[PDB]
Amino acid sequence: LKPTAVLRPYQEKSLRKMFGNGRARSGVIVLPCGAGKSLVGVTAACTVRKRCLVLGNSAVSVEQWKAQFKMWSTIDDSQICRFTSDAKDKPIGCSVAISTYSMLGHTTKRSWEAERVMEWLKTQEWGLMILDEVHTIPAKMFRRVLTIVQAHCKL
């Protein structure tokens, strides 16, 4: 996390409660959009320091997350990839991945190119799995993502 990032007390409390010890605890953090939930997610990734997967409910959110990661973290643009049907960044070429539940949770036949990344995603283990707007997660298709992706801790 670049020192430009400013962390508010409630944000710090939520992170301290999530990182009660040297081991990250899985669970849900409820913060308003104006409260900078994105920064907490980025901070958690910077804390875990391991390969992480961010999933948004829309392509607009995926764009927002990319901007926020660049805005708040030392990570370079090439190190971030937005695995999406509409756009390609050679996800296998970098460690940080961003996508959507509609893509990974997709029930119908995958495109040959998207299948390449998904198999790489399936085989790799994710240290942190950030889920945005998790109120949608209990959906029958979206919850499948949790069985498809292998993640050590999910926030």
Partner: peptide, 18 residues
């Protein structure tokens, strides 16, 4: 350089005494 959260929860209420 580790982050401030490695130490533990704040436990603010433990400061109260009777």
């Amino acid at each position: 350089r580790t982050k401030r959260w490695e130490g533990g929860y704040e436990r603010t209420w433990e400061i109260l005494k009777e």
